[PDB]
């Protein structure tokens, strides 16, 4: 019983964290086998940040200009190259702590765990969702860049995010592990704005299933609805439209609770139209949207 915003255990990722310094700039890097991945903006100065040319800046560097440290110990950089918005540094020794891993690009609405690091050292771990506008509502101070987001299945780490930037609204932007940004953001310090965000409807329904599974039931009702009727309402409240594919995904939780997906949709429809009126669901007074269906199934088995 109980339902918590749960992150994956972070150990397998902790053993990959290192520190990358260029002149007066230090960030985190990810050390797998003999490569260290970090954000390319590690090579920028104060002046270079309004409008950097990373090709120019990179060509002016040698292997020797990168200080890489695993803990207190310096790793010799024997190679460097740029892959999109990431720097790749070859080092002359392999990380024995390297887990089974892969790089994946996730879709908006999916969740992952973030290991917040500073100076190559883990600070905390928290779970979050990739917003529909490609930002993350993270907790990141100066020097957190290079921190990674990941999921774990069996013993395999799927790296999906590396932190690069904070936007003026205070939400966060980064890339996958090929250095491609999520969203239309660039690694330069110009005013950039996030698209208007929206509520991840699929996850809200999953979380209402989690509520039901843990005895929170007051919001249910006798009604049912159609996909189109539901969408016409949710869209008025800035909820993502729900598709048949999304309905299908909710199947297992539907079966487990004996509540039809469209019956759960009608419940949500009334909640949006009438509010919650003092009441809470799983302790919250607003509808949570940072749990996927798979998350709910995993935690509530």
């Amino acid at each position: 019983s109980g339902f918590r915003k749960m992150a994956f255990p972070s150990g397998k990722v902790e053993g990959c964290m290192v520190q990358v310094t260029c002149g007066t700039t230090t960030l985190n890097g990810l050390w797998l086998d003999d490569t260290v991945y970090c954000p390319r903006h590690v090579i920028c100065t104060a002046e270079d940040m309004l409008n950097p040319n990373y090709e120019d800046l990179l060509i002016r560097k040698s292997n020797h200009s990168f200080l890489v440290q695993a803990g207190n110990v310096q790793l010799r950089v024997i190679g460097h190259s740029m892959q999109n918005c990431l720097l790749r540094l070859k080092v002359d020794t392999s990380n024995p702590k390297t887990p089974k891993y892969k790089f994946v690009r996730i879709q908006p609405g999916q969740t992952f765990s973030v290991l917040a690091c500073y100076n190559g050292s883990p600070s905390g771990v928290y779970q979050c969702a990739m917003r529909p506008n490609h930002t993350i509502k993270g907790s990141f101070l100066n020097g957190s860049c290079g921190s990674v987001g990941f999921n774990i299945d069996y013993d395999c780490v799927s790296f999906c995010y590396m932190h690069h930037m904070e936007l003026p609204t205070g939400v966060h932007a980064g890339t996958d592990l090929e250095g491609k940004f999520y969203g239309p953001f660039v690694d330069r310090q110009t005013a950039q704005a996030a698209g208007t965000d929206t509520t991840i409807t699929l996850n809200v329904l999953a979380w209402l299933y989690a509520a039901v599974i843990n005895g929170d039931r007051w919001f249910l009702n006798r009604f049912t609805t159609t996909l189109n009727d539901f969408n016409l309402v949710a869209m008025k409240y800035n909820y993502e439209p729900l598709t048949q594919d999304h309905v299908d995904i909710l199947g297992p939780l539907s079966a487990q609770t004996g509540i039809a997906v469209l019956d759960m949709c009608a419940a949500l429809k009334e909640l949006l139209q009438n509010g919650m009126n003092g009441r809470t669901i799983l302790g919250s007074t607003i509808l949570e949207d940072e749990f996927t269906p798979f998350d709910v199934v995993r935690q509530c088995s």
Binding site: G143, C145, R188
Partner: peptide, 4 residues
């Protein structure tokens, strides 16, 4: 945006 601030490079973090």
């Amino acid at each position: 945006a601030v490079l973090x």
